[PDB]
Design a protein around this ligand. Structure first.
Ligand SMILES: C[C@H](O)[C@@H](O)[C@@H](O)[C@H](O)CO
Ligand SMILES: C[C@H](O)[C@@H](O)[C@@H](O)[C@H](O)CO
Ligand SMILES: C[C@H](O)[C@@H](O)[C@@H](O)[C@H](O)CO
Ligand SMILES: [Mn+2]
Ligand SMILES: [Mn+2]
Ligand SMILES: [Mn+2]
Lengths: 605, 605, 587
C-alpha cells in the first residue's frame, strides 16, 4: 500500500491482499488483596501467561510461515480497572481471541473479558495452594449466565506450585483452542470472490451473503467472467511474466493422452494456442483475487488492487466452458503450492463457484496451513461391486468399501501425495516443501486435453492418483433453510488399490481427471455404521479433503462460529466446545449443540 | 401474629415466619352412571383415596416435624359439578398438588383438575373388572392435549378388586410425587433474603429475581450489611439471649489452632471480643430471616417482623470481611440443627450470597428435611496425583479418584456425619437427633482463627472432617442465558482416606476449613465416564451436598418446576416425569426434557 | 474519560482515466469539512475537542474499504460517516461494522449521482441489517460549493453527538453502593440491560466499605482538612425542622459535617480511583471501580444509622467543590440505576450536569386556586409538576449560571467564579429530617429559577421487551412568591424544588399536564438544561431502545434509514418493530 500520485491506493512490494496477523490476547488474572497475597502470586501468575505465549508463538504459524503473535495484558488483573486497561490494549492490538490464566482465586465478573464477538478460553492451574480451579468454574459460570461463550481448560493431575511446565493435556487444549480461534481471526474482514455466479444449478454456487456476513465476518465480491476476456484482449496482465510462464510450462507440464472423439480432436496448433490462454487465465484469476503491483506499472491502476479475496471460485460451466478453454489449469495451479514464480502459499479456490466447498477448504486450510483437495464424491464402491467388477476381494483399509473422489478436471498437485515425511505421503505447508517434492509432483501428473463433448471450448484437465495410506479428513458445509450452515466431517485414509483394480475402476469412470480413493473410519454409530451410510448422508456432491485428522479442530472451530455439526466420526472424548454447551445437555451432545447454536446464533448478526 | 396496639403485625409465640403446611388434594373419580354401577363402586373408590391419604400422612413430615396434611374431595367425582365442588374446597384448603384415584372408567375432561399452577398425579387401579387403567390413559391424554402436566401412576401387577394394599411400585411413585410436590408448595410465596449483594464477582451472587418469581413463586428481599452494624451499635438484639449464648459457646465451642502469619496473630483480648461479635452476627442473621418476638418487647417493633425468608445469604467478602469478623460462625450455626436455645430446624443459608447454591440447598432440604452442606469444589484428585503425592494406591470407592469439597470457612456441623443409624454415618431431621449426637458433633469440630491475609476483620472458621462412606448427592442450579435455570445432580459417597493421605492432601490445601472427600458414582455415560469428567462439567465453583441418594426425587421436582436437567447419574428406570414429557420423545430423554421445559416454561410467567 | 473518534470515509467512483481523478479533490474535501465541522463544534466531557479519523485514501474498491477498516480498528472509532459527491459501488465500498452507528452524506448535486449512491448504499444497509442514517440536503448545490448547508449540519451534528454518547458509555461501569433501596424497581439492578444495550459492566460494593475506609483512614487527610475549612466558609447550614426531642446538639451536628465530607471523598474515590490513596499505602483501593455513573442505596439500612447521602449525592452531581471547578460524577440517589442511566444519556449528549428528582405532585389549576387563591397564567396556566428529590440535587440545578440574562446549566469549562458563588449563596443545607433519616446528615435546599428550557427523561425496563425511553421537553416555572411558599411548606420545605411544565401537543400523552404525569413510568426523572428530545430519539435508535412517549415534533425525528421500511405512517409502531427485530447491540 502506497498512495497513488492522484487518487487511490495501489500495491507495491508484495500483493495488495496480505495474509493478516490476528493476535491472541493473554490475560493473567490475580487475587486483588494486597499486603501479602497478591504480591506473592504476581510472579507465578505472570509466568503462566509468558509460558502460554511462548507455547503458541513457538508452535503455530500464520499461512505466510511467520510465527503467531501474542499480547499480554499491561498488568495482572485483580480489579476491574485492570480489566479495562487490558481491553484497551487488545482493541488496538488486533486481538482475535483471549486466554485467561491464573493460579489463584480472582473476582469473577470484575476480572472477566466482556467481548461478545471473539472466543475466550480460561486456564486454571490445578494446584492446592490456591483456588485456581475454583476461579475457573466461577468465571465460566458468569460466562454462561451472561451468554458470552468461554472454553474451560483444567488439567487432570494436581501440579506443584513451583512447577512451570504446561501439562500435555492442557497443551492439547490450548493449541486446539488457538488453532481454531486463529482461523476465525484470519477469515474476518476478508472476502469471497465469485467469478461468474451460478454453475449448472448447483446449490453452493448460489452464493448466500448472509452466511458470509453473519457467520464468518466476510464480504462478497463478484465479477462476470467477461472480465477475463477483457483482460486478455486489452493486455491487462504482466507480459514479462507471461513469457517466463510459457517457458516454464513447456519445460515442466506434460500434456496428456487425448481421449477425445475423433472429429473433436484439436490440431496441435490449436492446442498450443489453448496452452497460452489457460496460463493467462491463471494469472488473471490470481490477480483478481489478490492484486498485482505490476498491473499498476503497466498503467492499470484500478485493476492492480484486486478483490481482497481469501478464497474464490470460477463458475466455468456452462456459458464460459462452452466457448473458451476451461478453468482446470487455473483451478489446479491456484490450489497448488508453486508455479513459475516459485514455491508459494496456495490461493484457496472453488471449482464451479461452489462457494460452500470453498469455505469448507478454507476451514481446512486455516486450521492446517496445508493446501486442499476439491472433489466430486463420484461413486461408492461396495466390496460386492468391486468383487463382481474386478474379481478382487478388498482388504485392510479398503475392506469395508470406499469412495471415489474425483473432481471434474482440476486438483491441487500437492494432492498427489508426493511430499514425504518419515517415509509417508503427506501434504505440507509451502515453507516445508523441498525441490525434489515439487519435481515428484510434476513428474507424476499429466494434463489431458479436455473432453469436448462437455467442454467444447477446450483446455487441459489434471490427472494423477493420490498415494494411498495418507490420513485425511473430508469436509462439507451445507446450508439448511431456516437453520443456516451445518458442518459434516469424515476422517479416514486414502487408499492404494491393487493396480488392476485401480485401472479397471478408473477407466469406467473419467480417467482424464484426478483420483483419490477414500475410506472413512467407521464407528458403528450414526452415519458411520458403513461406508455406504457415509455417502448416503453426504449433503452435497462436493467435498473438501485435507491431509491429517483435523475433526476435533473443526468441531472446536464450528462451535466458535456457532455452526452445528450434523455428522462427524471424531471420538467423543476429543469434542472440545465452550463450557456452556454443557448447560444445554451432557448426554445428547448433538441436540445440545443444535440448541446452543440456535440460541446464541451467528457472531455478527 | 397479633395486631400491634397502634400499627402493624408483630410476632408472638414462635417466630414471625412459620413453616407452611401445604396440603395434598385427593380426588376420587367415579363412573357417573347410577342405578347400579356408581353405587357399587363408591366404597372401593373412596377407600383408594383414604389409603393414599394415610400413606402420605403417616410417612411424610413438614420441615417442622408435623405430619403432612391431606384433603379429600367433598364427594366422589363423576360429573363436572362434583369437580367444581372439589376445586372450591381445594382453593380454600391450601392445596399444593393433586392426586386423582380411581378403580373404574370416568369421563375424561368432565372429571379432570384444570389447575395450571400445581402438579397433578393420577393413579388408576390395575384391575380387570373396570377400566381403571383406561381412565388413566384417557385423562392423561386430555392433560397433554390441554397442556396441563400430569403424572401417571400405573402398577405392574393386576390386583384383585377386593385388595386394598397399595403395591410397593405404586407407593414409590406416590411418595416420590408427593415429596417433590410438597417442596414446590413449601417454597411458594416465601422469600430469599440477600445480606449484601454481589460477592467477588460470583455468578450466583448476582441475584436474579426473574428466576425466583417465575420458577419458584418466590420473593426477593435485601439488606445492606450495614444493618448488622446498626443492630450491634443500637442494641437491637436480645441481651438476655446474648448472655446465655456467650456462656454456652465458652462451654461447647473449642477454639482451634491459629495458623496466622506471625505479625497477623491477634491478642487473646481481641479474640474474645471477636467471639462476642460473631455470636451477635448469628442472632442478627437469624432474626433478619425469620423475625423475633423478643425484639418487639425491647421496643424494636419494625425489626421484630423479619424478612419472611425460607433461605438467605451473606455476601461477606470483600467489604465486610476486610473490616469485621467474618460470617463463618453465623453461616455454620444457621445451617446446624442446634445452638444454645436447643435442637432446631436449620435455617438454609448461602455463603457469599450464592443465591443459586442457596436454592440448590433448599431443594435438597425440602426433599429430605435434613440440613445441607455448602462447599467449594476445590480439587479433583486423580489416582496418579494421589500416587505421586502420597505413595498410596487408591482403592474401593476412592479408586477412580475423587473431589475435595471444602467451603471457605463454614459448614453445617451435621455435616461431620456424627449422627448414626444402624452403625452408619448420616444426617438426620432435627427431631430424630439425640443429645449424644449433638455432643459428638461439637466434640469433633474446632474453630480456628480466620486467616487474616484473606479475612482481615478476623472471626473463626469451622474445621471437621466428614465421616467416610455416607451416601450423598451433590447438586447445583446454574442460570443459562436465554434458557433459564438448569439442574445438575451427582449421587455418590463420602470417603475415608487413609490418615496419612488425608493429612497430606489437607495440609497443602486449607486445613482450617471443613472437609468432605467425595466420589461420584460413574456410569460410563455422559459426564460420568470418569471423576475428572464430572468436575470438568460442574457448572459453578459451588455445590450443595445432602445425605442420601435423592437424584430421582430432584428429577421429579425439576420437571414440576420445568427446570431442565443437564447432567445426572440417576438410573434411567428411576426417571419419573409428567406423562406428557413422553410425547416430546422416548429415546432422547434429555432433549425431550429440554423441549418440554422450553415449551411449557416456568409456572408463574 | 475516553476519546472515541468519528471515522470519516470518503467514497468515490472507481473508474480511472478521467472520472476518479477528477473527483478526488472534491470528495476528499467533503471528508475534511465534516471532520472540521465536528472537531470545531463538539467536545468531550473533559472539555477537549472531539477527534476524527479519515480513511487513508478515497474508497473506490473493496481493498480500500479493507484498509479504511484496518485503520479505524486501531483508532478507537465509535461511529462512521461516509461522504461522496459521485456514484460508487455500493456493497464494495460500504462499512460492515455491525456494532457501531453509520451515516452516509451524499452531496445533492447534479453533475454526479451522489444521491443515487446514497440511496443505493442505504438499500444495502437495510437488506443486510446494518442500520445507517441517511443525510441528504434539501437544495441542489453547485459542484464547487464547499459550505455544508444548514439542514445537513443539523443532521451531521445530531448524529455525531448521539454516536459519541454511545462511544463514551461503552466498556465503562455502573457502580452500585448497596443494592436495592426500599423495593424501588430501578434499584434492582439489571446487568443484562447494561451489558446488552450499553456495552457496560456492573460493579458492586456493600455500604460497609464506607465505614471501613472511615475507621481505617482510607482517604486523603490533607484533602480532608482543606475540605472542612472550605465547607465552613461556603456551605450554609439551613433551618432545623426537627421536632424537639430529635433535634441534635451543635457538637453532634458538627461531627456529622465531618462525616458527610468524608462520604463525599470516599464515594468519588470509589468511582474513579485516587492516586493519593496509593501514596498513603492502600494500593488496592487507589484504582477505583471504573464508573462513568454510580448510585448509593442509602435507605433503609444505612440512613437508619449514619448520616445520609445527600451531601455526597449533591456534590458528586455539582460542578465544583473545595478542589475547584470540575466535571460532575453522574450519581443516582437510592441506587436508582435507571435514573442514573437517564441522567447519563442527558450528560453525554450535552456535557451539562443533571437534576435527579421525584415527580412529587401534579398541581392542577383548580387545586392551586383552591389552596392559594391564585389563577395560574403563562407557561404555568395549564397546571404543572413539583419535581423535588428526597434530599439532594446538583447545585448547578439552581439555574444561577447565566447566558444572555437567561438561566442555564453550563458545561464546567464555561462556568464563571461568580456563578459558583451565586449557586452557593442560593442554597442552604437543613439538617436531615430524623423521622425519615434517624442517622442524620443535611439535605440541599434551593429553588430552580423559572423560565429555563429543560427536558425530563426516564428509562424504564418493561418485562419481555427491555428498556423503553420517555421524554418530556418543557420549561421551569417561577411562581408568585406566596404561592410558591404555600405549596412548598405543605410538601417538603427542607428539600430542593423545581417547578416544571411540559409542552403539550394534543397528541398521545401530551394532551394535558395530568396525562404527562399519569403516563410517567417511575417516581423519578432526570432533568437537563435544554431541549434535547431529538438528540435522545436519535441516541435511542442507535441503541435500539424504543421511545414510548415524547413531545418532540415529528419533523425533527431522525432515525436510521431502515426504520422507514418498518413503516412511515405509524412511527411509534415502526420503532418498536425495528428495535424488537434488531435487538440490543451486544446480544
Ligand atoms: C461434466 C459434468 O458436467 C460435471 O462437470 C458435473 O457433474 C460436475 O462435476 C458436478 O459438480
Ligand atoms: C479465600 C478466597 O477468597 C475464597 O473465599 C474464594 O475462592 C471463594 O471460596 C470462592 O467461592
Ligand atoms: C422519605 C422517603 O423515603 C423518600 O425518600 C421516598 O419518597 C423516595 O424519594 C422515593 O424515591
Ligand atoms: Mn463437480
Ligand atoms: Mn466459595
Ligand atoms: Mn426519591
Amino acid at each position: 500500500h502506497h498512495h497513488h500520485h492522484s487518487s487511490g491506493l495501489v500495491p507495491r512490494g508484495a500483493h495488495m491482499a496480505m495474509i493478516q496477523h490476528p493476535r491472541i490476547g493473554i490475560r493473567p488474572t490475580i487475587d486483588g488483596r494486597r499486603q501479602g497475597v497478591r504480591e506473592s502470586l504476581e510472579v507465578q501468575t505472570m509466568n503462566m501467561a509468558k509460558s502460554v505465549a511462548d507455547l503458541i508463538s513457538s508452535t503455530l504459524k500464520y499461512p505466510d510461515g511467520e510465527p503467531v503473535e501474542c499480547v499480554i495484558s499491561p498488568s495482572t488483573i485483580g480489579r476491574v480497572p485492570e480489566a479495562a486497561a487490558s481491553h484497551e490494549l487488545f482493541k488496538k492490538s488486533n486481538v482475535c481471541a483471549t486466554i485467561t490464566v491464573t493460579p489463584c482465586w480472582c473476582y469473577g465478573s470484575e476480572t472477566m473479558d466482556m467481548s461478545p464477538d471473539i472466543p475466550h478460553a480460561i486456564w486454571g492451574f490445578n494446584g492446592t495452594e490456591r483456588p485456581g480451579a475454583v476461579y475457573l468454574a466461577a468465571v465460566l459460570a458468569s460466562h454462561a449466565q451472561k451468554g458470552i461463550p468461554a472454553f474451560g481448560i483444567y488439567g487432570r493431575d494436581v501440579q506443584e506450585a513451583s512447577d512451570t511446565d504446561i501439562p500435555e493435556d492442557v497443551k492439547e487444549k490450548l493449541l486446539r483452542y488457538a488453532r481454531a480461534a486463529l482461523a476465525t481471526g484470519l477469515m474476518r474482514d476478508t472476502a469471497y470472490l465469485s467469478m461468474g455466479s451460478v454453475s449448472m444449478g448447483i446449490g453452493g454456487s448460489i452464493v448466500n451473503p448472509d452466511f458470509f456476513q453473519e457467520y464468518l465476518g466476510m464480504r462478497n465480491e463478484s465479477v462476470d467472467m467477461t472480465e477475463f476476456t477483457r483482460r486478455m484482449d486489452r493486455g491487462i496482465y504482466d507480459p514479462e511474466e507471461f513469457e517466463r510462464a510459457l517457458k516454464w510450462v513447456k519445460e515442466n507440464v506434460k500434456e496428456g493422452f487425448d481421449h477425445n472423439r475423433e472429429d473433436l480432436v484439436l490440431s496441435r496448433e490449436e492446442k498450443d494456442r489453448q496452452w497460452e490462454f489457460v496460463i493467462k487465465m491463471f494469472m488473471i484469476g490470481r490477480d483478481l483475487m489478490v492484486g498485482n503491483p505490476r498491473l499498476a506499472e503497466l498503467g492499470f491502476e484500478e485493476e492492480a488492487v484486486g478483490h481482497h479475496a481469501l478464497v474464490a471460485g470460477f463458475q466455468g460451466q456452462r456459458q464460459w466452458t462452452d466457448h473458451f478453454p476451461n478453468g482446470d489449469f487455473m483451478e489446479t495451479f491456484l490450489n497448488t503450492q508453486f508455479d513459475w514464480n516459485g514455491i508459494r502459499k496456495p490461493f484457496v479456490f472453488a471449482t464451479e463457484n461452489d462457494s460452500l466447498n470453498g469455505v469448507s477448504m478454507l476451514f481446512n486450510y486455516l486450521l492446517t496451513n496445508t493446501p486442499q483437495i476439491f472433489a466430486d464424491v463420484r461413486t461408492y464402491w461396495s466390496p460386492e461391486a468391486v468383487k463382481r467388477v474386478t474379481g478382487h476381494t478388498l482388504e485392510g483399509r479398503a475392506a469395508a468399501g470406499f469412495l471415489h473422489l474425483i473432481n471434474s478436471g482440476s486438483c491441487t498437485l500437492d494432492g498427489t501425495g508426493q511430499a514425504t515425511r518419515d517415509g509417508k505421503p503427506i501434504m505440507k505447508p509451502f515453507w516445508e516443501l523441498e525441490e525434489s517434492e515439487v519435481q515428484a509432483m510434476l513428474e507424476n501428473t499429466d494434463f489431458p486435453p479436455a473432453n469436448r463433448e462437455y467442454f467444447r471450448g477446450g483446455g487441459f484437465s489434471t490427472r494423477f492418483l493420490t498415494k494411498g495410506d495418507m490420513p485425511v479428513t473430508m469436509v462439507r458445509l451445507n446450508l439448511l433453510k431456516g437453520v443456516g450452515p451445518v458442518l459434516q466431517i469424515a476422517e479416514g485414509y486414502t487408499l492404494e488399490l491393487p493396480e488392476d483394480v485401480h485401472h479397471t475402476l478408473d477407466n469406467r469412470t473419467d480417467p482424464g481427471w484426478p483420483t483419490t480413493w477414500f475410506a472413512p473410519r467407521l464407528t458403528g454409530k450414526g452415519a458411520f455404521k458403513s461406508v455406504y451410510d457415509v455417502m448416503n448422508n453426504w449433503g452435497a456432491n462436493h467435498g473438501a479433503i485435507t491431509y491429517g485428522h483435523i475433526g476435533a479442530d473443526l468441531i472446536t472451530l464450528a462451535s466458535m462460529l456457532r455452526i452445528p455439526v450434523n455428522m462427524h466420526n471424531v471420538p467423543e472424548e476429543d469434542i472440545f466446545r465452550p463450557k456452556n454447551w454443557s448447560l444445554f445437555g451432557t448426554e445428547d451432545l448433538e441436540s445440545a449443540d443444535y440448541r446452543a447454536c440456535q440460541l446464541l446464533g451467528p457472531l455478527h448478526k
